């Protein structure tokens, strides 16, 4: 009804909150006729005005979008994830939960409830849709109707109170490889490496202790190991009492890289150490024998402007992340890195790969690029959060190409789709929401994966602008069954 | 889907086609907290691309919007009316019916099916939502869920194959007063005056013959008569054979006004005759004894640029319609009019009234105005102005929506059951054609010139629609 007129709820970040459907979206160009599957993605979209006018972008209720590809057509469906939070607040007609990860600010009537918004990532696994939020269990939804079934503990087997929003699909076993931090509640060092079978059964839950009380947003998975990047993005229960942001980045502490053998336990966990820095999303990780590589954008401080963290406000240059490879060797002695190498020389984030090569050696990556040299002619703030360029890098040659969306548009996280099951690596398509911030229309744009610089080959033209979201995923129709 | 790259499907007329919901719309200003009820309106929104790319605006599947007012909040729900046409075309994944009102261009698989889109008007009556399209029966929908129940013949009693999209609610009996043209199929002169009880039972269906086969889009109802305006917007099977537009306006033929006593039959119907002209929507009609008045915009030719008719291309000057009163006297001899007089000197359409005075003497009317002297900063006939006229004085006031926006049909809401005439609110969709957002604006009915007192901010632009109506919550089954 009356949302606050802070920048977080105005302009390009105005509330959307519409659930709905479009059958057979308008197409410009030609949807590749063989494509048959689902593209899911999610954005935060507070159902009601927040209890705090300072509410973080990442605190809004998860709105799940589905784009079903088939027969040269794409259909649109969008629904709220009906978390425990969402259900109870709808019955009340108002917001009951408080600030980001701060149960102290919750209403008395919802104390002890799962506070998750399921607003970070959505992925098909075991015939169902996993809607994920770091601080809460995994929420199960129907991949096609987007009905919510509820939080899962995987048949009572999973002990961890939380479930990450960045699982990886082992390309051999089909297992869902995930992890959890704060596994025994907020401010607990408890961790866990998790694998879920292709039928949804919990196969393993390996606990271990983290070096910090810190955010563990993403991780890497290789053929033999799980890779945990630890940066001092620290949590403070004291700060929640002072109604200050849960997370604060400490520039003085080192970063760690923990390698866990996937068939071992906490005793086999080796920690390597490197200099202070801020680590972003993992493009991919793989191991060559005992040599472990993980690729991710690295910056000197927080790179996400909408992520309200404790300390000095968002420093734009310090927040520039560059795709970087970290290399460690399990056969070595000590905790030293073998190598750190910058893979791409333009500020980037939201990396993606050909998922058929997840956890293995690879060369093709796609990413959103921040090109501050381009004009931006859209009123409504959001200049620092502007990802206006789509990039492709060939890691085997260092060659790259990119596409600028123009002075009115932003681009959301891309996603690769193979041309066929046995196509060469990176042969196929990249899709991404291209949002026009003047006309307020969103196109699901389809690029040739190997020629993104040529611009979209097809655009699914929505009569609505989809709010800036987070992560999404493609699933072939063969996975629905 | 690949829709045509024509103006009829581009820019401000791009397809929308989204069904969906918004709980508790964003409000700017204050929604009058006493209001509890529903605002329904509908727009054409072809589910799939047409079989012929010259497809008319009026041929698109009906998309029904609901704004449910309650305790200072407004919720949004929008659903397709699931006509027989819509259902079968969805099953086929494509358009099967052809050009506007042209069964010869239909696919063989939908021969004989009802071709209606239920895209013209939506109104609550007898606890249900009547979704109407001239060429087809009335479609029954649920007023709150917008689920479609199907076409009705009112328990098999109604003989007419068609049902108008401009019924009036008699303010005394509560009956739904309607009519039909082409009542025995396309090209048939058969007409019918229809009344339906407040519980949905057919109370009367009075047949008669029209002076020629023409569009009979709107009509008037007074205390004692039904009033039918006849203009030579003609159709012929020949034009359908030549793949030409169903309707063609003949500037050489006269217009008629047929007055039917509401408790009589075809023999009591009196026809009056006047000069050629194009008649628009009816603001209201009433009779003072045998003196019958009907108010409506009148123009030299077609006033709707989105209406493709046969002849010369759209002439905007000829299409300027001005609210005009026609008067006839049932006590007179012959077919002469008593007079015709212009009530408002600015091009206008989509007239509305305090419907508590429908069929009766009245003075307050609201309208959309085409103010061509104002700027427009976006890439035909633009209704950029909302007007209020006091017919007892000729005084008027208006509100310009600004250089980015247009306005859709308004609708009056009384401040309370005992409020005097025109005391209350006027609501209308105000559409921003640059940002592509629509607001449901609420004006003070007697001071529209002050601008909205409240705006329900939608995160989407509602496509140009047609007619809608307000219904107090008390008229719904609880
Ligand atoms: Mg009216
Ligand atoms: Mg004006
Ligand atoms: Mg308009």
Short mmCIF file of N, CA, C and O in Angstrom, two decimals, chain A residues 422-481:
data_model
loop_
_atom_site.label_atom_id
_atom_site.label_comp_id
_atom_site.label_asym_id
_atom_site.label_seq_id
_atom_site.Cartn_x
_atom_site.Cartn_y
_atom_site.Cartn_z
N UNK A 422 25.50 -33.47 -26.91
CA UNK A 422 26.89 -33.80 -27.17
C UNK A 422 27.63 -32.68 -27.88
O UNK A 422 28.72 -32.90 -28.41
N UNK A 423 27.07 -31.47 -27.90
CA UNK A 423 27.72 -30.36 -28.57
C UNK A 423 29.07 -30.06 -27.91
O UNK A 423 29.26 -30.33 -26.73
N UNK A 424 30.00 -29.48 -28.66
CA UNK A 424 31.26 -29.03 -28.04
C UNK A 424 31.00 -28.06 -26.90
O UNK A 424 29.93 -27.45 -26.80
N UNK A 425 31.99 -27.92 -26.03
CA UNK A 425 31.86 -27.03 -24.88
C UNK A 425 31.51 -25.62 -25.35
O UNK A 425 32.12 -25.10 -26.29
N UNK A 426 30.54 -25.01 -24.68
CA UNK A 426 30.17 -23.64 -24.99
C UNK A 426 29.51 -23.45 -26.34
O UNK A 426 29.34 -22.30 -26.76
N UNK A 427 29.16 -24.53 -27.03
CA UNK A 427 28.43 -24.44 -28.29
C UNK A 427 26.94 -24.42 -27.98
O UNK A 427 26.39 -25.42 -27.50
N UNK A 428 26.29 -23.29 -28.23
CA UNK A 428 24.89 -23.15 -27.90
C UNK A 428 24.47 -21.71 -27.68
O UNK A 428 24.78 -20.84 -28.50
N UNK A 429 23.80 -21.45 -26.57
CA UNK A 429 23.14 -20.17 -26.37
C UNK A 429 23.37 -19.66 -24.96
O UNK A 429 23.61 -20.44 -24.03
N UNK A 430 23.29 -18.34 -24.81
CA UNK A 430 23.27 -17.68 -23.51
C UNK A 430 22.02 -16.83 -23.45
O UNK A 430 21.76 -16.03 -24.36
N UNK A 431 21.24 -17.00 -22.39
CA UNK A 431 20.03 -16.22 -22.18
C UNK A 431 20.24 -15.33 -20.97
O UNK A 431 21.00 -15.66 -20.05
N UNK A 432 19.56 -14.19 -20.97
CA UNK A 432 19.62 -13.27 -19.84
C UNK A 432 18.51 -12.25 -19.98
O UNK A 432 18.14 -11.87 -21.10
N UNK A 433 17.97 -11.81 -18.85
CA UNK A 433 17.00 -10.73 -18.84
C UNK A 433 17.69 -9.40 -19.13
O UNK A 433 18.64 -9.02 -18.43
N UNK A 434 17.23 -8.71 -20.16
CA UNK A 434 17.70 -7.37 -20.50
C UNK A 434 16.57 -6.40 -20.18
O UNK A 434 15.51 -6.45 -20.81
N UNK A 435 16.80 -5.53 -19.20
CA UNK A 435 15.76 -4.69 -18.63
C UNK A 435 15.90 -3.26 -19.13
O UNK A 435 16.97 -2.66 -18.98
N UNK A 436 14.83 -2.72 -19.71
CA UNK A 436 14.80 -1.34 -20.17
C UNK A 436 14.23 -0.47 -19.05
O UNK A 436 13.05 -0.59 -18.70
N UNK A 437 15.07 0.40 -18.50
CA UNK A 437 14.71 1.18 -17.32
C UNK A 437 13.99 2.48 -17.65
O UNK A 437 13.62 3.21 -16.72
N UNK A 438 13.80 2.80 -18.92
CA UNK A 438 13.00 3.95 -19.33
C UNK A 438 11.59 3.53 -19.73
O UNK A 438 10.61 4.09 -19.23
N UNK A 439 11.47 2.54 -20.62
CA UNK A 439 10.17 2.02 -21.00
C UNK A 439 9.63 1.00 -20.01
O UNK A 439 8.44 0.68 -20.05
N UNK A 440 10.49 0.47 -19.13
CA UNK A 440 10.08 -0.52 -18.14
C UNK A 440 9.51 -1.77 -18.81
O UNK A 440 8.42 -2.25 -18.49
N UNK A 441 10.27 -2.30 -19.76
CA UNK A 441 10.02 -3.61 -20.35
C UNK A 441 11.25 -4.48 -20.16
O UNK A 441 12.39 -3.99 -20.19
N UNK A 442 11.02 -5.77 -19.97
CA UNK A 442 12.08 -6.76 -19.89
C UNK A 442 12.00 -7.70 -21.08
O UNK A 442 10.91 -8.16 -21.45
N UNK A 443 13.14 -7.97 -21.70
CA UNK A 443 13.28 -8.99 -22.72
C UNK A 443 14.13 -10.12 -22.18
O UNK A 443 15.18 -9.88 -21.58
N UNK A 444 13.67 -11.36 -22.36
CA UNK A 444 14.57 -12.49 -22.21
C UNK A 444 15.32 -12.62 -23.52
O UNK A 444 14.77 -13.07 -24.53
N UNK A 445 16.58 -12.18 -23.52
CA UNK A 445 17.38 -12.14 -24.73
C UNK A 445 18.13 -13.45 -24.90
O UNK A 445 18.59 -14.05 -23.92
N UNK A 446 18.25 -13.90 -26.15
CA UNK A 446 18.96 -15.12 -26.49
C UNK A 446 20.14 -14.74 -27.38
O UNK A 446 19.95 -14.15 -28.45
N UNK A 447 21.35 -15.08 -26.94
CA UNK A 447 22.57 -14.83 -27.68
C UNK A 447 23.17 -16.14 -28.18
O UNK A 447 22.98 -17.20 -27.57
N UNK A 448 23.90 -16.06 -29.28
CA UNK A 448 24.83 -17.12 -29.64
C UNK A 448 25.97 -17.13 -28.63
O UNK A 448 26.67 -16.13 -28.48
N UNK A 449 26.14 -18.26 -27.94
CA UNK A 449 27.09 -18.31 -26.83
C UNK A 449 28.49 -17.88 -27.27
O UNK A 449 29.21 -17.23 -26.50
N UNK A 450 28.88 -18.22 -28.49
CA UNK A 450 30.22 -17.92 -28.98
C UNK A 450 30.31 -16.60 -29.75
O UNK A 450 31.38 -16.27 -30.24
N UNK A 451 29.21 -15.85 -29.85
CA UNK A 451 29.22 -14.55 -30.51
C UNK A 451 28.27 -13.59 -29.80
O UNK A 451 27.40 -12.98 -30.41
N UNK A 452 28.44 -13.45 -28.48
CA UNK A 452 27.55 -12.56 -27.74
C UNK A 452 27.68 -11.13 -28.24
O UNK A 452 26.73 -10.34 -28.16
N UNK A 453 28.85 -10.77 -28.77
CA UNK A 453 29.06 -9.42 -29.29
C UNK A 453 28.11 -9.10 -30.44
O UNK A 453 27.88 -7.92 -30.72
N UNK A 454 27.57 -10.11 -31.11
CA UNK A 454 26.62 -9.90 -32.20
C UNK A 454 25.25 -9.46 -31.71
O UNK A 454 24.40 -9.11 -32.54
N UNK A 455 25.00 -9.49 -30.40
CA UNK A 455 23.72 -9.12 -29.87
C UNK A 455 22.75 -10.28 -29.87
O UNK A 455 23.05 -11.37 -30.38
N UNK A 456 21.56 -10.08 -29.32
CA UNK A 456 20.58 -11.16 -29.26
C UNK A 456 20.19 -11.66 -30.64
O UNK A 456 20.05 -10.88 -31.58
N UNK A 457 20.03 -12.98 -30.76
CA UNK A 457 19.38 -13.55 -31.93
C UNK A 457 17.87 -13.56 -31.77
O UNK A 457 17.14 -13.58 -32.78
N UNK A 458 17.37 -13.55 -30.54
CA UNK A 458 15.94 -13.56 -30.27
C UNK A 458 15.69 -12.82 -28.96
O UNK A 458 16.55 -12.80 -28.07
N UNK A 459 14.51 -12.22 -28.85
CA UNK A 459 14.08 -11.52 -27.65
C UNK A 459 12.65 -11.93 -27.34
O UNK A 459 11.76 -11.73 -28.17
N UNK A 460 12.43 -12.49 -26.16
CA UNK A 460 11.09 -12.74 -25.65
C UNK A 460 10.63 -11.48 -24.92
O UNK A 460 11.09 -11.20 -23.80
N UNK A 461 9.74 -10.72 -25.55
CA UNK A 461 9.43 -9.36 -25.12
C UNK A 461 8.28 -9.39 -24.12
O UNK A 461 7.12 -9.61 -24.49
N UNK A 462 8.60 -9.16 -22.84
CA UNK A 462 7.60 -9.12 -21.78
C UNK A 462 6.98 -7.73 -21.68
O UNK A 462 7.70 -6.72 -21.80
N UNK A 463 5.66 -7.63 -21.44
CA UNK A 463 5.02 -6.32 -21.29
C UNK A 463 5.18 -5.76 -19.89
O UNK A 463 4.32 -5.02 -19.40
N UNK A 464 6.28 -6.11 -19.23
CA UNK A 464 6.52 -5.75 -17.84
C UNK A 464 8.02 -5.82 -17.61
O UNK A 464 8.72 -6.60 -18.26
N UNK A 465 8.52 -4.99 -16.70
CA UNK A 465 9.92 -5.04 -16.33
C UNK A 465 10.09 -5.93 -15.10
O UNK A 465 9.50 -5.66 -14.05
N UNK A 466 10.89 -6.97 -15.24
CA UNK A 466 11.16 -7.88 -14.13
C UNK A 466 12.17 -7.23 -13.20
O UNK A 466 13.23 -6.76 -13.63
N UNK A 467 11.83 -7.19 -11.91
CA UNK A 467 12.69 -6.57 -10.92
C UNK A 467 14.04 -7.26 -10.86
O UNK A 467 14.16 -8.47 -11.06
N UNK A 468 15.08 -6.47 -10.61
CA UNK A 468 16.43 -7.00 -10.47
C UNK A 468 16.43 -8.18 -9.51
O UNK A 468 16.02 -8.05 -8.35
N UNK A 469 16.89 -9.33 -9.99
CA UNK A 469 16.89 -10.53 -9.19
C UNK A 469 18.29 -11.05 -8.92
O UNK A 469 19.27 -10.31 -9.03
N UNK A 470 18.39 -12.34 -8.57
CA UNK A 470 19.68 -12.94 -8.27
C UNK A 470 19.98 -14.08 -9.23
O UNK A 470 20.31 -13.82 -10.40
N UNK A 471 19.87 -15.32 -8.79
CA UNK A 471 20.36 -16.44 -9.57
C UNK A 471 19.22 -17.25 -10.17
O UNK A 471 18.12 -17.32 -9.61
N UNK A 472 19.50 -17.84 -11.33
CA UNK A 472 18.56 -18.69 -12.04
C UNK A 472 19.32 -19.81 -12.71
O UNK A 472 20.55 -19.86 -12.68
N UNK A 473 18.58 -20.72 -13.34
CA UNK A 473 19.20 -21.92 -13.90
C UNK A 473 18.33 -22.47 -15.03
O UNK A 473 17.10 -22.35 -15.00
N UNK A 474 18.99 -23.07 -16.01
CA UNK A 474 18.33 -23.82 -17.06
C UNK A 474 18.29 -25.30 -16.70
O UNK A 474 19.23 -25.84 -16.12
N UNK A 475 17.18 -25.95 -17.04
CA UNK A 475 17.04 -27.39 -16.88
C UNK A 475 16.37 -27.94 -18.13
O UNK A 475 15.28 -27.48 -18.50
N UNK A 476 17.02 -28.89 -18.79
CA UNK A 476 16.40 -29.55 -19.92
C UNK A 476 15.11 -30.23 -19.49
O UNK A 476 14.96 -30.66 -18.34
N UNK A 477 14.15 -30.31 -20.42
CA UNK A 477 12.88 -30.96 -20.10
C UNK A 477 13.08 -32.39 -19.63
O UNK A 477 12.26 -32.91 -18.85
N UNK A 478 14.15 -33.05 -20.08
CA UNK A 478 14.40 -34.43 -19.67
C UNK A 478 14.57 -34.57 -18.17
O UNK A 478 14.47 -35.69 -17.64
N UNK A 479 14.83 -33.48 -17.45
CA UNK A 479 14.98 -33.53 -16.00
C UNK A 479 13.65 -33.44 -15.28
O UNK A 479 13.62 -33.59 -14.05
N UNK A 480 12.55 -33.22 -15.99
CA UNK A 480 11.22 -33.20 -15.40
C UNK A 480 10.64 -34.60 -15.55
O UNK A 480 10.01 -34.94 -16.54
N UNK A 481 10.88 -35.42 -14.52
CA UNK A 481 10.59 -36.86 -14.51
C UNK A 481 11.60 -37.53 -13.58
O UNK A 481 12.80 -37.25 -13.66
#
